[PDB]
Design a protein around this motif. Structure first.
Motif, PDB file in Angstrom:
ATOM      1  N   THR A  88      45.449  41.361  35.402  1.00 20.42           N
ATOM      2  CA  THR A  88      44.672  42.526  35.963  1.00 20.42           C
ATOM      3  C   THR A  88      43.204  42.978  35.875  1.00 20.42           C
ATOM      4  O   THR A  88      42.543  42.822  36.777  1.00 20.42           O
ATOM      5  CB  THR A  88      45.436  43.792  35.379  1.00 20.42           C
ATOM      6  N   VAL A  89      42.564  42.507  34.723  1.00 16.74           N
ATOM      7  CA  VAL A  89      41.193  42.644  34.423  1.00 16.74           C
ATOM      8  C   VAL A  89      40.573  41.597  35.262  1.00 16.74           C
ATOM      9  O   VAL A  89      39.275  41.861  35.943  1.00 16.74           O
ATOM     10  CB  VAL A  89      41.011  42.242  32.916  1.00 16.74           C
ATOM     11  N   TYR A  90      40.768  40.263  35.044  1.00 17.97           N
ATOM     12  CA  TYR A  90      40.053  39.148  35.950  1.00 17.97           C
ATOM     13  C   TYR A  90      40.299  39.264  37.469  1.00 17.97           C
ATOM     14  O   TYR A  90      39.586  38.870  37.883  1.00 17.97           O
ATOM     15  CB  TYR A  90      40.591  37.702  35.327  1.00 17.97           C
ATOM     16  N   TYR A  91      41.294  39.867  37.889  1.00 11.88           N
ATOM     17  CA  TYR A  91      41.587  40.346  39.305  1.00 11.88           C
ATOM     18  C   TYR A  91      40.675  41.068  39.887  1.00 11.88           C
ATOM     19  O   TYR A  91      39.658  40.837  40.778  1.00 11.88           O
ATOM     20  CB  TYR A  91      43.034  40.556  39.640  1.00 11.88           C
ATOM     21  N   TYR A  92      40.258  42.067  39.420  1.00 15.66           N
ATOM     22  CA  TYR A  92      39.296  43.364  39.628  1.00 15.66           C
ATOM     23  C   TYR A  92      37.925  42.890  39.240  1.00 15.66           C
ATOM     24  O   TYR A  92      36.974  43.031  40.018  1.00 15.66           O
ATOM     25  CB  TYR A  92      39.777  44.454  39.035  1.00 15.66           C
ATOM     26  N   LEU A  93      37.810  42.221  38.198  1.00 18.06           N
ATOM     27  CA  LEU A  93      36.272  41.529  37.704  1.00 18.06           C
ATOM     28  C   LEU A  93      35.961  40.521  38.712  1.00 18.06           C
ATOM     29  O   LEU A  93      34.637  40.780  39.075  1.00 18.06           O
ATOM     30  CB  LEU A  93      36.526  41.166  36.494  1.00 18.06           C
ATOM     31  N   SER A  94      36.752  39.779  39.269  1.00 17.37           N
ATOM     32  CA  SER A  94      36.361  38.576  40.286  1.00 17.37           C
ATOM     33  C   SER A  94      35.783  39.288  41.654  1.00 17.37           C
ATOM     34  O   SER A  94      35.275  38.585  42.502  1.00 17.37           O
ATOM     35  CB  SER A  94      37.266  37.758  40.338  1.00 17.37           C
ATOM     36  N   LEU A  95      36.322  40.503  42.037  1.00 16.09           N
ATOM     37  CA  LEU A  95      36.031  41.100  43.346  1.00 16.09           C
ATOM     38  C   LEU A  95      34.679  42.132  43.054  1.00 16.09           C
ATOM     39  O   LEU A  95      34.508  42.853  44.060  1.00 16.09           O
ATOM     40  CB  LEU A  95      37.462  41.811  43.864  1.00 16.09           C
ATOM     41  N   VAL A  96      34.048  41.999  41.933  1.00 14.97           N
ATOM     42  CA  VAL A  96      32.720  42.809  41.769  1.00 14.97           C
ATOM     43  C   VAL A  96      31.703  42.659  42.688  1.00 14.97           C
ATOM     44  O   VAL A  96      31.434  41.410  42.995  1.00 14.97           O
ATOM     45  CB  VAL A  96      32.524  42.613  40.342  1.00 14.97           C
ATOM     46  N   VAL A 133      27.233  37.775  39.936  1.00 16.05           N
ATOM     47  CA  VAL A 133      28.298  37.568  38.872  1.00 16.05           C
ATOM     48  C   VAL A 133      28.678  36.076  38.869  1.00 16.05           C
ATOM     49  O   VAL A 133      28.505  35.416  40.155  1.00 16.05           O
ATOM     50  CB  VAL A 133      29.499  38.549  39.158  1.00 16.05           C
ATOM     51  N   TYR A 134      29.055  35.454  37.897  1.00 16.38           N
ATOM     52  CA  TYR A 134      29.466  34.012  37.996  1.00 16.38           C
ATOM     53  C   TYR A 134      30.980  33.796  38.348  1.00 16.38           C
ATOM     54  O   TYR A 134      32.009  33.689  37.750  1.00 16.38           O
ATOM     55  CB  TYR A 134      29.211  33.332  36.608  1.00 16.38           C
ATOM     56  N   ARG A 135      31.113  34.360  39.715  1.00 17.43           N
ATOM     57  CA  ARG A 135      32.554  34.381  40.158  1.00 17.43           C
ATOM     58  C   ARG A 135      33.341  33.328  40.196  1.00 17.43           C
ATOM     59  O   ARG A 135      34.551  33.592  39.848  1.00 17.43           O
ATOM     60  CB  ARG A 135      32.226  34.877  41.690  1.00 17.43           C
ATOM     61  N   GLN A 136      32.876  31.964  40.409  1.00 12.16           N
ATOM     62  CA  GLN A 136      33.816  30.983  40.253  1.00 12.16           C
ATOM     63  C   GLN A 136      34.530  30.853  38.993  1.00 12.16           C
ATOM     64  O   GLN A 136      35.667  30.441  38.927  1.00 12.16           O
ATOM     65  CB  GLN A 136      32.898  29.555  40.527  1.00 12.16           C
ATOM     66  N   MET A 137      34.006  31.058  37.903  1.00 20.14           N
ATOM     67  CA  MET A 137      34.792  30.969  36.555  1.00 20.14           C
ATOM     68  C   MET A 137      35.549  32.159  36.218  1.00 20.14           C
ATOM     69  O   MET A 137      36.586  32.354  35.530  1.00 20.14           O
ATOM     70  CB  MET A 137      33.707  30.846  35.143  1.00 20.14           C
ATOM     71  N   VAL A 190      37.259  33.704  38.951  1.00 19.93           N
ATOM     72  CA  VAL A 190      38.766  33.251  39.704  1.00 19.93           C
ATOM     73  C   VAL A 190      39.366  32.215  39.049  1.00 19.93           C
ATOM     74  O   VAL A 190      40.636  32.249  38.762  1.00 19.93           O
ATOM     75  CB  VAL A 190      37.957  32.649  41.038  1.00 19.93           C
ATOM     76  N   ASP A 191      38.733  31.299  38.492  1.00 21.44           N
ATOM     77  CA  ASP A 191      39.406  30.044  37.506  1.00 21.44           C
ATOM     78  C   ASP A 191      40.049  30.617  36.343  1.00 21.44           C
ATOM     79  O   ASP A 191      41.153  30.217  35.870  1.00 21.44           O
ATOM     80  CB  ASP A 191      38.591  28.998  37.305  1.00 21.44           C
ATOM     81  N   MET A 192      39.750  31.626  35.540  1.00 20.56           N
ATOM     82  CA  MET A 192      40.121  32.494  34.537  1.00 20.56           C
ATOM     83  C   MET A 192      41.604  32.895  34.876  1.00 20.56           C
ATOM     84  O   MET A 192      42.419  33.001  34.467  1.00 20.56           O
ATOM     85  CB  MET A 192      39.248  33.422  34.035  1.00 20.56           C
ATOM     86  N   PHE A 193      41.532  33.687  36.346  1.00 24.69           N
ATOM     87  CA  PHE A 193      42.868  34.381  36.878  1.00 24.69           C
ATOM     88  C   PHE A 193      43.812  33.163  37.198  1.00 24.69           C
ATOM     89  O   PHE A 193      45.005  33.442  36.636  1.00 24.69           O
ATOM     90  CB  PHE A 193      42.165  35.094  37.894  1.00 24.69           C
TER      91      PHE A 193
END
Length: 198
Positions: A133-141, A146-150, A152-155
């Protein structure tokens, strides 16, 4: 301090993180693979528990839990303080890589790399649901670089289809992980033509 777990808070934070594991190694490893358990972490047992082939005591499951609890309150404070591009380093103040110690570093990029290093060990699918839940909404900031690639890879690692033959997608579907498709669809719609080219 500033989010340190060195008090009775650690018990209630471990309970909130479903990290109040049973103190017997034998019963814990059994209730780690049992879906009726609070602490259910994997459907499939690793056939080669590679940590148990070392000629010394690896750290306790309770130490791995206590570490993950610090990583998670620090990741919460880092994201909830809104500073996702971590440019603004903080210090001690007038207001009135893999060792957890008394220095607190309020950077989302530090604590996601700490959590990437915690992925090598068990945590319950309930905590995996909160993290997916956290890494989904964090990756759409949006707003800042933001370091978006990591993120997405965390999710992608949290929801993995094959991790020691465990499918965490179907364990999170059976846990009831639900994600808002409209945020994703809206961000993918920003690549359609907009009626002013400015």
């Amino acid at each position: 301090f500033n989010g340190m777990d060195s008090t009775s808070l650690l018990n209630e934070r471990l309970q909130h993180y479903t990290l109040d594991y049973v103190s017997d190694r034998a019963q814990h490893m059994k209730n780690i693979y049992d879906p009726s358990s609070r602490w259910f972490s994997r459907s499939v047992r690793p056939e080669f528990p590679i940590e148990e082939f070392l000629p010394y005591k690896t750290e306790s499951h309770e130490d791995q839990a206590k570490y993950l609890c610090h990583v998670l309150v620090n990741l919460y404070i880092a994201i909830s303080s809104l500073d996702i591009q971590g440019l603004i380093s903080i210090s001690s103040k007038d207001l009135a890589k893999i060792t957890a110690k008394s220095a607190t570093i309020v950077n989302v990029n530090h604590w996601t790399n700490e959590l990437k290093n915690c992925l090598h060990f068990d945590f319950p699918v309930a905590l995996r649901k909160s993290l997916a839940t956290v890494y989904y909404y964090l990756s759409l900031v949006q707003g800042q670089k933001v370091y978006r690639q990591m993120h997405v890879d965390m999710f992608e690692r949290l929801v993995s289809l094959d991790d020691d033959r465990t499918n965490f997608t179907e364990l999170l579907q059976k846990q009831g992980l639900l994600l808002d498709h409209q945020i994703m669809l809206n961000f993918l719609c920003e690549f359609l033509p907009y009626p002013d080219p400015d």
